[PDB]
Ligand SMILES: Nc1ccn([C@H]2C[C@H](OP(=O)(O)OC[C@H]3O[C@@H](n4cnc5c(=O)[nH]c(N)nc54)C[C@@H]3O)[C@@H](CO)O2)c(=O)n1
């Protein structure tokens with residue numbers, strides 16, 4: 001029942017802060033957004049920009065996704081982000097991560113449904 | 125089962141003709157599009173324009189729907205349409221309709237989803 005859109009927010013959005021505020025940022029976040037749930041998600045990026053600016057990325061530079069597909073977009077400007085990487089001593093269920101702050105262009109895959117008619121209201 | 129959008133085409137789309145052929149048009153189309161199957165749909169409009177053109181309406185003048193919701197759109201140009209309205213003699217299962225040809229702006233309710241981010245691909 002979770003939309004994919006809401007899934008992206010949960011896994012990658014953190015606009016309440018301008019940067020990761022401590023080396024334990026990833027340990028905290030990866031667990032609170034349920035990314036250690038059934039195993040330790042090894043690589044995850046959190047973005048510290050308004051939801052609007054992130055969403056706007058879908059109207060910026062179209063690039064190929066790293067898996068070949070074409071619905072990826074690269075931000076024209078750098079954004080404050082946090083790289084989360086599972087360390088060499090992590091092991092489910094005690095997931096452990098290294099936290100790295102960065103300012104990079106983000107690249108995202110975007111999806112939607114073009115608006116189509118679904119009901120004839122009236123003619124005028 | 126049938127999508128809202130597929131049902132809209134079934135009920136209202138007839139790009140294969142540029143206007144109602146005769147006064148029996150509605151009696152025939154209401155039957156073939158199954159709008160008389162279990163009951164007589166009372167009023168129904170068919171649009172004689174390309175699918176491209178009708179769908180582009182969702183990008184045109186936004187207006188309020190007859191029911192108050194705000195996702196209705198009105199075509200900028202008038203379009204060729206046929207009004208199908210039940211006659212006083214229409215009694216299920218012998219649905220009967222009056223065919224009226226016209227050129228007016230159509231108003232339809234549109235649906236879809238904003239193109240938003242759904243996966244984080246990479247940083248660069
Ligand atoms: N515990 C670890 C630690 C490191 N690794 C690998 C992956 C690392 O490459 P990256 O390019 O950092 O990241 C790999 C790709 O991931 C991508 N990436 C970045 N952020 C995300 C994200 O949020 N989701 C996602 N699906 N992929 C992401 C971009 C890169 O192509 C590599 C070198 O450090 O070692 C690992 O396998 N297990």
Ligand SMILES: Nc1ccn([C@H]2C[C@H](OP(=O)(O)OC[C@H]3O[C@@H](n4cnc5c(=O)[nH]c(N)nc54)C[C@@H]3O)[C@@H](CO)O2)c(=O)n1
Pocket residue numbers: 120121122123136166167168169170209210211
């Ligand atoms: N059997 C009959 C015969 C005549 N009428 C009325 C409706 C006519 O006014 P309209 O403005 O066409 O009003 C019609 C309204 O119907 C609506 N409409 C039109 N086409 C459709 C459609 O495809 N679906 C839908 N749900 N509503 C439609 C919007 C229009 O304002 C009026 C005068 O002929 O008599 C009737 O109500 N029942």
